[PDB]
Amino acid sequence: MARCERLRGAALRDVLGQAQGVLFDCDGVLWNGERIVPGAPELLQRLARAGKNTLFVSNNSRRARPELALRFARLGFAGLRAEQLFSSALCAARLLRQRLSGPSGAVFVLGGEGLRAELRAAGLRLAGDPGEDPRVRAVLVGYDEQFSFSRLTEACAHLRDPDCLLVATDRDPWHPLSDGSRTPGTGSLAKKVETASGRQALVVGKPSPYMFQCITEDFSVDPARTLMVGDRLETDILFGHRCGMTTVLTLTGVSSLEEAQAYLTAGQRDLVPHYYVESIADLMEGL
């Protein structure tokens, strides 16, 4: 029964000591734009040497795994493997691969090159690619910098066919840019498409539990022995509760302690973290 307690001292040593793994959200937790959270790279190294699994979850779709791995290495996060990285783009690609199996058809993507790349790596054919004309069997909505009313209308035409799937990477209100600014996230486009088409999308990214299924397909992950660390209550903490994980709010990102406390006293227990730290650097003393 959470809680929102301060994670340090004996509590920290116990909670971290029993943990077999830690799942980290990235933006607002490891970094903000190109500003790394002080102590973040060292924590990850200490966790690995402590024998604990470290996995990474993000609703950012700008980078496919290879490029995402290269980013981690640039900001000073060494010794990570691509297999530890779980983006909403990766999980959407794997969902679509399964649903479009039994080999037919193509995916119409509202989104960028990183998303397209992950889909191609899952062996999916895309509607915008050459040798065109295949039937569109799914529309995938992701963060789309080049969105236009022309492509919305195109997407809705494909969705006239009830058999055409509608999938969204996530419903985040905001997408963080490298320069510290932000712009509306997939949430706005998803609702636009859902409203225009009169449909409800299959959402794969957190707080959807499907992201967790994606993870547990590749890794042995006991949710009762795993910490979920994030900076947004409505996405990361909710995700943790839905998956049965211990949740930790870090304060270096979007959500504030006051917000955490407002949900508590308002009875929204799924939006209240079990614990909080000022930054993930504070977890290092538990090791």
Ligand SMILES: [Mg+2]
């Ligand atoms: Mg975040």
